[PDB]
From Swiss-Prot:
Protein name: Papain-like protease nsp3
Chain's role: Responsible for the cleavages located at the N-terminus of the replicase polyprotein. Participates together with nsp4 in the assembly of virally-induced cytoplasmic double-membrane vesicles necessary for viral replication. Antagonizes innate immune induction of type I interferon by blocking the phosphorylation, dimerization and subsequent nuclear translocation of host IRF3. Also prevents host NF-kappa-B signaling. In addition, PL-PRO possesses a deubiquitinating/deISGylating activity and processes both 'Lys-48'- and 'Lys-63'-linked polyubiquitin chains from cellular substrates.
Domain of life: Viruses
Protein's cellular compartments: Host endoplasmic reticulum membrane
Topology class, membrane: Multi-pass membrane protein
Catalyses which reaction(s): Thiol-dependent hydrolysis of ester, thioester, amide, peptide and isopeptide bonds formed by the C-terminal Gly of ubiquitin (a 76-residue protein attached to proteins as an intracellular targeting signal)
Region of the whole protein represented: 1026 to 1191 of 7096
Activity regulation details: Inhibited in vitro by GRL-0617.
Organism: Severe acute respiratory syndrome coronavirus 2 (2019-nCoV)
Domain (Macro) ranges: 1-166
Length: 166
């Protein structure tokens, strides 16, 4: 949890322009959040990147979790190993608003973060899930009460989020 180079947005939300895979390798946090889907199939975006950085160990573990427990619900989560990236991976499902899933569930998704004192995380429902990323940061600020270190890869998006928030 020895994070460095973050900008403090609120009492408990920090942001950095960084690849979440590189941040996890440098800090080895207690918890890294994955932007997952209900079957834990890590095909692209942040999920694909975290799974590739584990050389597919995360996907084999996720498949066994699904065969034993069934899929997650939208807004839900599960805790699995963080492999070489973290002690634990918190897999969280934000709504895919491009598929008609309710934006109301983005608040439920971020509520999962409150079970952990410190997290390294991406914005939820951004990218292929279709939510506006600045809206997703606002829900994060309004819902998360524990200490969250947000990593945003794209510099253009990062600059827009810092300008809209500060
Ligand atoms: N080594 C890697 O491949 N790392 C990463 N691959 C992605 C892919 C998508 C993203 C996304 C966003 C971003 O933070 O720029 C907002 C939407 C999806 C972030 C990473 S970090």
């Amino acid at each position: 949890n020895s994070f460095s180079g973050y900008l403090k947005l609120t009492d408990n939300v920090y942001i950095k322009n960084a690849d979440i895979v590189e941040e996890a390798k440098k800090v080895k946090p207690t918890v890294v959040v994955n932007a997952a889907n209900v079957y834990l199939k890590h095909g692209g975006g942040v999920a694909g990147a975290l799974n590739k950085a584990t050389n597919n160990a995360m996907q084999v573990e996720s498949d066994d979790y699904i065969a034993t427990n069934g899929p997650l619900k939208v807004g839900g989560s599960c805790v699995l190993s963080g492999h070489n990236l973290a002690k634990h991976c918190l897999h969280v499902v934000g709504p895919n608003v491009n598929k008609g899933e309710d934006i109301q569930l983005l608040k439920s998704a971020y509520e999962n973060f409150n079970q952990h004192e410190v997290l390294l995380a991406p914005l939820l429902s951004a990218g292929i899930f279709g939510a506006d990323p600045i809206h997703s940061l606002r829900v994060c600020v309004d819902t998360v009460r524990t200490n969250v270190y947000l990593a945003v890869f794209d510099k253009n998006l990062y600059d827009k989020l810092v300008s809209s928030f500060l």
